[PDB]
Design a protein around this ligand. Structure first.
Ligand SMILES: [Zn+2]
Ligand SMILES: [Zn+2]
Ligand SMILES: [Zn+2]
Ligand SMILES: [Zn+2]
Ligand SMILES: [Zn+2]
Ligand SMILES: [Zn+2]
Ligand SMILES: [Zn+2]
Length: 86
């Protein structure tokens, strides 16, 4: 089973990276470490590398995604997506 996390915007420093940020609890729940590939599915599905959360975001059930990943997952900011190992 995947986990669900709420889409939020990427920090500018991560825009144009095929990568998303999620905290360690979230990584632990799907069994991935920083640098591994995750599958992300809103209404569409895409893949991206796992980055750790910024400190301000630890413990939040969010996943930070830039515009390209949001487009490819078919998900808007504030909507949940399913995240699983790739
Ligand atoms: Zn920064
Ligand atoms: Zn990207
Ligand atoms: Zn790993
Ligand atoms: Zn890093
Ligand atoms: Zn939507
Ligand atoms: Zn929000
Ligand atoms: Zn749902």
């Amino acid at each position: 089973l995947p986990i669900k996390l709420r889409v939020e915007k990427a920090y500018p420093e991560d825009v144009g990276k095929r990568a998303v940020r999620m905290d360690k609890a979230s990584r632990d729940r799907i069994g991935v470490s920083e640098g591994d590939l995750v599958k992300i599915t809103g209404s569409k599905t895409t893949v991206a590398r796992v980055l750790p959360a910024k400190k301000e975001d630890v413990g939040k059930g969010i996943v930070r995604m830039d515009k390209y990943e949001r487009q490819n997952a078919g998900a808007s900011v504030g909507e949940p997506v399913e995240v699983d190992r790739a």
